[PDB]
Amino acid sequence: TENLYFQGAMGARLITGGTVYTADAQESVHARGAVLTVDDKVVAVGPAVEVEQAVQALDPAVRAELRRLDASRMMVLPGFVNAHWHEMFAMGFTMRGALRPPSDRADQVAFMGGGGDMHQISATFDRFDGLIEAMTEDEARAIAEYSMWIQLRGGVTTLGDMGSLNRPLAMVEAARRLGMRFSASTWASDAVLAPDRSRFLRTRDADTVLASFEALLGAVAADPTGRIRCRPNVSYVTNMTDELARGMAELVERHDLPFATHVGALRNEADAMRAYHGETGVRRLAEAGLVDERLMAGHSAFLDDQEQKLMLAGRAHISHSPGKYGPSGESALTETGVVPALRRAGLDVSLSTDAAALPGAGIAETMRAAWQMYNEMSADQTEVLPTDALAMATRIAAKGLRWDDAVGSLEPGKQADLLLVRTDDWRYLLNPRPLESFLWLAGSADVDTVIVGGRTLVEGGRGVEVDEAALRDRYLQALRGFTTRALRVPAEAVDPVLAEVAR
Amino acid sequence: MGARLITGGTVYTADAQESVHARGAVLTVDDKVVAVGPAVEVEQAVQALDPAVRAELRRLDASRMMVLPGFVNAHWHEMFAMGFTMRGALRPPSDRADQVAFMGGGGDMHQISATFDRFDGLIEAMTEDEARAIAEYSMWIQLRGGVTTLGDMGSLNRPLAMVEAARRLGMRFSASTWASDAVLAPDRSRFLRTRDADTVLASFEALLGAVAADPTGRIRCRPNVSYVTNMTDELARGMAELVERHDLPFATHVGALRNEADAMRAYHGETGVRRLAEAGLVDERLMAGHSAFLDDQEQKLMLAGRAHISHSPGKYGPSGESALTETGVVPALRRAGLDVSLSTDAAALPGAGIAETMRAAWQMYNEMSADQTEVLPTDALAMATRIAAKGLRWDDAVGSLEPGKQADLLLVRTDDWRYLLNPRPLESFLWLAGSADVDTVIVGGRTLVEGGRGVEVDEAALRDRYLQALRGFTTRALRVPAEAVDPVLAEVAR
Numbered sequence: 001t002e003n004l005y006f007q008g009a010m011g012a013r014l015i016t017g018g019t020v021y022t023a024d025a026q027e028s029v030h031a032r033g034a035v036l037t038v039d040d041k042v043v044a045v046g047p048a049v050e051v052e053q054a055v056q057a058l059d060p061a062v063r064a065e066l067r068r069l070d071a072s073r074m075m076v077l078p079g080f081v082n083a084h085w086h087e088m089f090a091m092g093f094t095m096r097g098a099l100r101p102p103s104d105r106a107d108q109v110a111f112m113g114g115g116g117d118m119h120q121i122s123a124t125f126d127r128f129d130g131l132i133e134a135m136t137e138d139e140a141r142a143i144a145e146y147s148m149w150i151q152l153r154g155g156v157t158t159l160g161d162m163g164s165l166n167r168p169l170a171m172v173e174a175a176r177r178l179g180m181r182f183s184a185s186t187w188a189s190d191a192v193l194a195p196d197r198s199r200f201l202r203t204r205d206a207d208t209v210l211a212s213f214e215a216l217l218g219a220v221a222a223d224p225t226g227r228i229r230c231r232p233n234v235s236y237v238t239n240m241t242d243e244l245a246r247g248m249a250e251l252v253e254r255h256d257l258p259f260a261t262h263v264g265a266l267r268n269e270a271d272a273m274r275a276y277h278g279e280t281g282v283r284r285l286a287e288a289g290l291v292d293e294r295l296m297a298g299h300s301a302f303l304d305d306q307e308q309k310l311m312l313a314g315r316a317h318i319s320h321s322p323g324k325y326g327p328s329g330e331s332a333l334t335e336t337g338v339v340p341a342l343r344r345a346g347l348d349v350s351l352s353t354d355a356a357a358l359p360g361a362g363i364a365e366t367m368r369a370a371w372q373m374y375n376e377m378s379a380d381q382t383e384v385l386p387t388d389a390l391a392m393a394t395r396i397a398a399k400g401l402r403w404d405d406a407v408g409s410l411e412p413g414k415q416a417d418l419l420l421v422r423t424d425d426w427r428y429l430l431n432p433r434p435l436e437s438f439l440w441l442a443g444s445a446d447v448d449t450v451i452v453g454g455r456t457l458v459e460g461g462r463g464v465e466v467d468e469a470a471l472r473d474r475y476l477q478a479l480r481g482f483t484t485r486a487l488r489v490p491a492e493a494v495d496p497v498l499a500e501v502a503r
Numbered sequence: 504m505g506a507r508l509i510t511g512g513t514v515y516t517a518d519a520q521e522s523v524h525a526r527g528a529v530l531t532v533d534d535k536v537v538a539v540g541p542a543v544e545v546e547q548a549v550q551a552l553d554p555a556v557r558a559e560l561r562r563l564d565a566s567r568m569m570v571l572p573g574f575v576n577a578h579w580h581e582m583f584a585m586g587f588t589m590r591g592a593l594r595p596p597s598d599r600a601d602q603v604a605f606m607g608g609g610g611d612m613h614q615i616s617a618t619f620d621r622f623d624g625l626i627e628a629m630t631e632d633e634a635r636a637i638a639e640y641s642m643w644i645q646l647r648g649g650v651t652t653l654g655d656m657g658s659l660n661r662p663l664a665m666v667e668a669a670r671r672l673g674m675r676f677s678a679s680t681w682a683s684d685a686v687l688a689p690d691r692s693r694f695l696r697t698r699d700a701d702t703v704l705a706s707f708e709a710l711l712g713a714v715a716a717d718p719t720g721r722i723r724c725r726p727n728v729s730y731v732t733n734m735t736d737e738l739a740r741g742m743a744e745l746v747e748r749h750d751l752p753f754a755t756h757v758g759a760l761r762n763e764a765d766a767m768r769a770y771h772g773e774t775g776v777r778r779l780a781e782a783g784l785v786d787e788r789l790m791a792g793h794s795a796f797l798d799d800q801e802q803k804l805m806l807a808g809r810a811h812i813s814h815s816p817g818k819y820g821p822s823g824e825s826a827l828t829e830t831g832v833v834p835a836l837r838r839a840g841l842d843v844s845l846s847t848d849a850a851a852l853p854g855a856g857i858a859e860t861m862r863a864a865w866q867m868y869n870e871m872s873a874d875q876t877e878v879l880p881t882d883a884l885a886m887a888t889r890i891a892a893k894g895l896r897w898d899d900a901v902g903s904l905e906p907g908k909q910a911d912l913l914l915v916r917t918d919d920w921r922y923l924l925n926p927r928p929l930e931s932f933l934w935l936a937g938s939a940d941v942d943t944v945i946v947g948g949r950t951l952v953e954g955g956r957g958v959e960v961d962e963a964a965l966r967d968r969y970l971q972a973l974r975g976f977t978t979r980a981l982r983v984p985a986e987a988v989d990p991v992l993a994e995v996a997r
């Protein structure tokens with residue numbers, strides 16, 4: 001039941017006097033604009049005077065309880081839709097993480113760097129099911145809630161799981177407790193690329209993987225909040241049998257779902273796919289019937305001309321993460337230039353954070369990265385306008401997630417999912433485009449207020465219902481158990497680091 | 504300033520080994536660093552102080568902070584006088600009708616050349632009071648973001664106004680003068696000489712004379728050429744003679760744009776780095792802004808001369824510049840061991856600061872090479888501190904936390920969610936922090952910023968004087984109607 005998490009109706013709210021970015025079809029921006037919300041929905045958005053006319057249509061009772069929020073020193077955005085994310089905070093001690101020396105001077109190219117260590121990546125992904133099984137229900141819920149809180153704190157109101165090292169129902173429960181929206185998934189890996197083998201090794205039955213997703217779908221079918229959906233994913237096309245691909249196509253058609261995977265992510269992927277599967281990623285997905293309007297492809301940069309045409313013909317979707325490629329040693333923007341090229345050719349392309357095991361670039365940081373990096377590559381300050389970067393992190397992401405019915409833009413009849421950012425400091429002075437100043441000089445921590453379905457979850461940069469110190473301390477205790485027991489890191493290395501945390 | 508001990512934080516030195524000290528310390532005495540390293544080494548230096556100096560020691564527990572060297576932003580322009588007209592305050596809030604212009608699309612070489620040659624007239628039109636108010640606010644914004652040493656590479660402001668602003672603010676400043684003696688006009692097949700080289704050089708020599716006597720150690724000067732398009736051979740040779748005679752650094756912009764080389768061949772008969780080399784300017788004194796559109800011979804001239812490149816990857820995309828990826832030359836020359844630093848460049852409203860530029864280099868150089876080790880976070884810091892200081896010829900006194908160097912340092916708080924469990928707070932800073940997260944700024948042992956607020960600076964007062972000055976200059980010199988300016992000023996969130 002929804003009342004376990006939150007109680008009460010939100011009534012009418014008028015948020016007025018700020019610059020309002022709608023991310024509607026026309027990318028509408030309203031200086032001295034306003035948003036009127038009633039309960040969970042936007043009723044009116046536009047110039048303040050026009051929206052005051054909508055306020056005049058409210059009855060004596062709704063008017064008497066109207067909450068007026070003076071946003072005159074603020075910018076209003078739609079809530080961010082981060083459709084390509086992974087819960088990986090259980091790996092905080094080992095994944096580019098807490099045990100590294102403070103000096104970075106001895107760092108090496110590994111994992112996704114240097115074109116990608118395809119055997120290591122494939123083997124690591126196939127080990128997720130065993131580690132998820134090893135995680136306790138208590139550990140999963142504590143780690144999920146803190147990890148997803150960090151997304152919400154940065155203005156993510158709708159979050160999409162594209163394959164997590166956590167228990168699916170733990171992440172669903174965390175989303176319910178936090179008040180945010182969540183597209184849940186399950187871990188899907190049924191093949192590994194092993195150095196001593198001439199084809200992929202099947203590591204589990206496709207039907208097992210599919211049944212796991214069907215169990216999640218069953219669990220959240222009934223959900224009455226409107227905040228929980230699900231979307232099946234394949235971890236990575238290296239770890240995907242033809243039986244899993246065909247099974248996913250059947251499942252998505254039968255249940256009318258979106259679909260997500262990672263493909264064309266790495267320079268070294270194509271040769272490994274040919275060696276172990278006989279065919280590259282997009283062509284394997286296309287053979288299974290998965291290159292269509294339902295597909296959100298993560299990264300999707302290492303595509304040849306034929307694979308680019310398959311994506312365009314299918315009206316598929318790419319989620320791109322340009323804020324985080326460099327620190328991973330990925331080259332999914334500039335080495336091929338394919339994602340900006342497919343966007344110019346009319347493919348839907350959104351911006352996402354991807355994830356790792358400690359806080360990294362959020363949606364705000366990713367919007368800045370796209371604005372800088374796409375425009376520099378083309379010598380064109382108009383290729384990604386700031387309002388395009390916002391659309392890519394809101395409406396366009398919602399379209400790829402098949403949630404644009406309800407979220408991603410401030411328009412009448414959509415969910416009242418909004419951010420407020422303060423614009424009264426030196427960064428914003430004299431700029432009629434506060435979103436541009438935000439991309440120059442602000443980020444996740446400058447999100448002031450986060451509203452989901454008309455409910456304030458963050459205000460003044462602080463959780464309203466979230467107990468921030470308590471969520472952190474439960475996450476750290478859970479991480480201690482999982483790290484010492486499942487990852488076999490000695491307590492001697494873990495406990496003094498947790499003791500030195502600044503509380 | 505007496506003695507200050509800053510102890511318990513993670514200390515990034517940007518010394519020659521890029522040393523990082525977890526739970527490290529810095530001891531300063533008066534204007535200088537005396538000890539930096541592990542707490543035990545630094546406590547030995549505390550016990551070596553004059554007893555009266557130790558009795559008055561200012562102890563700062565930085566255990567919830569990160570300590571950095573002060574940022575050295577060696578390629579900057581004061582352009583805040585153009586806030587109403589230059590990608591500025593009069594634009595519509597919607598960006599949908601924006602066009603490729605100015606430096607975008609390979610560069611409008613005629614417009615760029617003509618615009619640069621108009622700077623002298625607009626500087627002359629600016630009052631001394633307007634210049635001082637605009638400079639002090641503009642330079643405050645750099646200081647607020649952790650810039651302790653700022654380098655002028657050609658400003659739309661009065662040089663002595665910017666020197667006075669630096670003196671008032673307490674920061675370090677390498678002052679320059681505007682130098683443009685040629686224009687590339689569409690109705691001509693050769694450059695047009697607009698001023699005499701000896702007069703342009705005399706303007707710089709007058710500034711050098713004005714700051715020669717400065718007793719603070721905080722004011723230096725460096726001659727620049729605006730842009731090689733606007734540079735005669737006589738100006739270039741005269742600059743080489745001047746910097747040899749006075750033992751100065753030299754700066755210009757060269758190889759900045761796709762369309763530059765063809766315009767340089769058409770109007771001057773030779774490309775920029777080759778023209779600088781002929782004049783004797785491609786040597787260890789040169790800081791070249793952008794310097795990406797270089798052929799193999801020009802790359803070899805830069806390496807042979809041990810010249811320096813200042814790169815601004817935080818701001819190329821919004822300008823429509825392509826000085827990172829279109830040629831890849833600057834990362835390649837850096838891998839080859841050329842000194843390459845990071846700078847903010849300019850514009851007329853706040854844009855990417857040094858912190859933002861460090862993040863940009865870390866993301867963008869590493870993505871281009873599929874190598875998370877090409878620019879480590881500590882490299883991005885060195886590029887914005889020690890290496891920048893070396894290019895500015897100020898590494899004698901600034902750019903790193905080492906005994907004998909100036910006590911110029913930053914404190915950044917690390918006690919929030921962004922930093923949790925990271926043994927590398929600089930990495931969390933590059934992921935999720937920026938200019939506004941600079942908490943404390945110390946120059947020569949003096950605290951100028953603390954808790955993100957000016958100590959002697961009245962930020963609201965500097966702002967209000969800048970806005971008044973901008974109103975006068977915009978209405979009078981830029982001829983923008985009061986009807987367009989006053990409503991924008993009326994809307995300011997005071």
Ligand SMILES: O=C(O)c1cccc(O)c1
Nearest residue numbers: 112236262265266298354
């Ligand atoms: O975002 C990912 O999970 C991913 C998966 C495979 C390759 C890669 O570079 C990234």
Ligand SMILES: O=C(O)c1cccc(O)c1
Nearest residue numbers: 606730756759760792848
């Ligand atoms: O940084 C500059 O002043 C500059 C000058 C010329 C070309 C360009 O792209 C930039």
Ligand SMILES: [Mg+2]
Nearest residue numbers: 459460463464
């Ligand atoms: Mg409250």
Ligand SMILES: [Zn+2]
Nearest residue numbers: 162298354355
């Ligand atoms: Zn991913």
Ligand SMILES: [Zn+2]
Nearest residue numbers: 024025411412
């Ligand atoms: Zn409409």
Ligand SMILES: [Zn+2]
Nearest residue numbers: 656792848849
């Ligand atoms: Zn410049």
Ligand SMILES: [Zn+2]
Nearest residue numbers: 871872873874
């Ligand atoms: Zn390479």
